[PDB]
From TrEMBL, chain A:
The organism's place on the tree of life at top rank: Bacteria
Signal peptide: none
Protein name: Vegetative insecticidal protein
Span of the entire protein shown here: 114 to 226 of 789
Gene: vip3LB
UniProtKB/TrEMBL annotation, chains C, D:
TM annotation in the entry: none
Superkingdom of source: Bacteria
Protein name (record): Vegetative insecticidal protein
Coiled-coil ranges from the UniProt annotation: none
Protein's organism: Bacillus thuringiensis
């Protein structure tokens, strides 16, 4: 366990490093996406748009939540197990085989 | 159901729930790990252990003091060992049950009693504000909508439903708290296991997504606050408040939802004896981010003016009358209410200020006026309304409004006394503004009465009035009283700056009422009384859910209210009754009959 | 209660059979019969509770 | 679990033989009985786990 914990913390740091290296590009592109979205205040809602949103928002919400929370906890990380409580709960809820996992 | 109590803003219940969460963290349970131990088997296991330890000790004494040394003694040893296994299992179960019953139960029952006692007042306040927000939302239109508003609704409805249901269910199961106590603890533990279970769609996930939609971290960078403001600001919405007050009420309701959700989450994690996570930090982060969103991207684009919510067709005599709606020295007008149940009446709230435009709960005088319909409405001969929106500078609070109907025209004059923001004193430095002449509007004579204003004319929370203006629409024959509030400043100074906030709500009831227990809600008629053994409290009777007074033979229910009156001053009586009653305001001395 | 009864009855049966297979002394057999009667009372109480649950 | 059980059964048997074949009859023997009973509890837990695992 004592060789496990530090190895995993180092692995999470090495991951977060490249993850942050990548995140800046998608941050700028999502800023541009938000800029183009602000112009949607005059486009009324169609049945197609309503359906697509009501169909995608759950999966998108859950994926975004998992990603951002994993990043947040891996950043907060930088016995130790008492400190990795949230990360272990997240990993146990994310790698769980389920009908709606 | 309003409440005459300082509503401390988001800071108030946020810090309250933070204190409750810290207290829950301080509670010590110890060996609260054996949850799957039926506590209703204590007597059974205790009897079995008491009856089996005797046999075990008998066998032990036999094998020890006994002088037998043979494989027969070895068989006796094996028998004693099997009995020891059974006894040890029974004793382990009994020990777990005893620990859970004498360490895990008292701590938690005390903790939950405290949690509920502290949640009582928060629930009251937030339930009233939720009623108001639900009225507003009913007044909204979401049939022809924008893409961003539709996306926000799609993203916020599921989490909102989940959080609301979970909060209500946890509150019910806590108030539920012998076999009944154990069954209620089992229900609470089931709810806790469901709330705290490890799945990506957990209660915590819905909390975080609710926050992400409240701040604007969703697909489109659209915060629920922006869509709320856009829906509430439209012209169709007619509410009793300004846009600032309505969006602030929206924020109050949703932040209280989130705070109570974090409280339930902590209580569940503690009830299950799980690792603590300290959600106070996350709760404060969420609430502060949402308040900052409201303060920066929402509050500046709102109007702090509130007008009449309703209109009523009425007529008024052309008899000229002077009216002076004034506040006592050192007071300020903070709200009005035009009610025309049977006769037109105007409630006016006056109160001394304390600091940053905060209203004093102790000084909340209420005056009543009756000649408003005869003043705002013509009978048969036209009318000329002078219309001009007054706007005094900051640090000036309206104190007097003077209506003078010299002829068939209507002209009002307003006075504003200087108010020091730092202190709570209003000096006698007055600015007087009238209705400008060049802009008058005429309502032509019409047999049908004009649409007098009606409803509550005041911010969601009683605040000083900056300006007052009248407006009249000739085509529609409408009349509106648009006042201006200081809620933006009071919020930027007290709540959105994370400081002690003090807010009062329009009581929605005649505080100036002199008939104690008029609604007769307190079952014990300490104020009222019955002369003869009859005429009692009919609980089934009254305005839906109240306790009415009843009369049968010849014993009438009476209440003494002689002192709190004045001679030759006009008064208004009101009462709902069913059957064939007889009401009399009578003086024991002298046969004078005022109202009969 | 079913598991408790099974184990207790197996113990009592083993005891009784092994003591009936070979009787050695007077006081030893006396004390064995005493503790066996006590174990039988315990088993009877357990079976009474189990039958009460079955009737319920 | 198999190693632990195989290593504890020897100690349990040694204590059992000591208390049986041994001619000591005293509160010392009673304390030895208590010690053997605790060791037997540990061994029984280990053996229950091992039996469940072997069956599965």
């Amino acid at each position: 366990l004592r060789v496990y914990l530090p190895k995993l913390t180092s692995m999470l740091s090495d991951v977060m490093k490249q993850n942050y290296a990548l995140s800046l590009q998608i941050e700028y592109l999502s800023k541009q996406l938000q800029e183009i979205s602000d112009k949607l205040d005059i486009i009324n809602v169609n049945v197609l748009i309503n359906s697509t949103l009501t169909e995608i928002t759950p999966a998108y919400q859950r994926i975004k939540y998992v990603n951002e929370k994993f990043e947040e906890l891996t950043f907060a990380t930088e016995d130790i197990l008492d400190e990795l409580t949230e990360l272990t709960e997240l990993a146990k809820s994310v790698t769980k085989n389920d009908v709606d996992g | 159901p309003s409440f005459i109590d300082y509503f401390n803003g988001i800071y108030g219940f946020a810090t309250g729930i933070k204190d409750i969460m810290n207290m829950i963290f301080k509670t010590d349970t110890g060996g609260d790990l054996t949850l799957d131990e039926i506590l209703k088997n204590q007597q059974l296991l205790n009897d079995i252990s008491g009856k089996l330890d005797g046999v075990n000790g008998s066998l032990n004494d036999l094998i020890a003091q006994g002088n037998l040394n043979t494989e027969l003694s070895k068989e006796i040893l094996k028998i004693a060992n099997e009995q020891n296994q059974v006894l040890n299992d029974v004793n382990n179960k009994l020990d777990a049950i005893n620990t859970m019953l004498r360490v895990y139960l008292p701590k938690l029952t005390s903790m939950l009693s405290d949690v509920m006692k502290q949640n009582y007042a928060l629930s009251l306040q937030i339930e009233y504000l939720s009623k108001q927000l639900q009225e507003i939302s009913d007044k909204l239109d979401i049939i022809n909508v924008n893409v961003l508003i539709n996306s926000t609704l799609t993203e916020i409805t599921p989490a909102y439903q989940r959080i609301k249901y979970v909060n209500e269910k946890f509150e019910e199961l806590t108030f539920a708290t012998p076999a009944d106590i154990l069954d209620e603890l089992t229900e609470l533990t089931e709810l806790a296991k469901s709330v705290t279970k490890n799945d990506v769609d957990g209660f915590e996930f819905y909390l975080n997504t609710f926050h992400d939609v409240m701040v604007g971290n969703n697909l489109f960078g659209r915060s629920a606050l922006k869509t709320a403001s856009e829906l509430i600001t439209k012209e169709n919405v007619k509410t009793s408040g300004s846009e600032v007050g309505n969006v602030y009420n929206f924020l109050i309701v949703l932040t209280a939802l989130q705070a109570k959700a974090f409280l339930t989450l902590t209580t569940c994690r503690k009830l299950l004896g799980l690792a603590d996570i300290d959600y106070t930090s996350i709760m404060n982060e969420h609430l502060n981010k949402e308040k900052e969103e409201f303060r920066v991207n929402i509050l500046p684009t709102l109007s702090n003016t509130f007008s009449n919510p309703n209109y009523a067709k009425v007529k008024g005599s052309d008899e000229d009358a002077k009216m002076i709606v004034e506040a006592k020295p050192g007071h300020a007008l903070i709200g009005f209410e035009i009610s025309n149940d049977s006769i037109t009446v105007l409630k006016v709230y006056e109160a001394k200020l304390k600091q940053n435009y905060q209203v004093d709960k102790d000084s909340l005088s209420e005056v009543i006026y009756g000649d408003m319909d005869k003043l705002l409405c013509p009978d048969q001969s036209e009318q000329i309304y002078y219309t001009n929106n007054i706007v005094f500078p900051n640090e000036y609070v309206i104190t007097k409004i003077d209506f003078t109907k010299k002829m068939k025209t209507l002209r009002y004059e307003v006075t504003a006394n200087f108010y020091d923001s730092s202190t709570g004193e209003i000096d006698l430095n007055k600015k007087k503004v009238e209705s400008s002449e060049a802009e008058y509007r005429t309502l032509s004579a019409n047999d049908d009465g004009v649409y007098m204003p009606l409803g509550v004319i005041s911010e969601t929370f009683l605040t000083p009035i900056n300006g007052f203006g009248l407006q009249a629409d000739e085509n529609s024959r409408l009349i509106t009283l648009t006042c201006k509030s200081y809620l933006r400043e009071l919020l930027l100074a007290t709540d959105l700056s994370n400081k002690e906030t003090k807010l009062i709500v329009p009581p929605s009831g005649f505080i100036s009422n002199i008939v104690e227990n008029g609604s007769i809600e307190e079952d014990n008629l300490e104020p009222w009384k019955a002369n003869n053994k009859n005429a009692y409290v009919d609980h089934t009777g009254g305005v839906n859910g109240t306790k009415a007074l009843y009369v049968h033979k010849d014993g009438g229910i009476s209440q003494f209210i002689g002192d709190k009156l004045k001679p030759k001053t006009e008064y208004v009586i009101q009462y709902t009754v069913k059957g064939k009653p007889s009401i009399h305001l009578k003086d024991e001395n002298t046969g004078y009959i005022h109202y009969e």
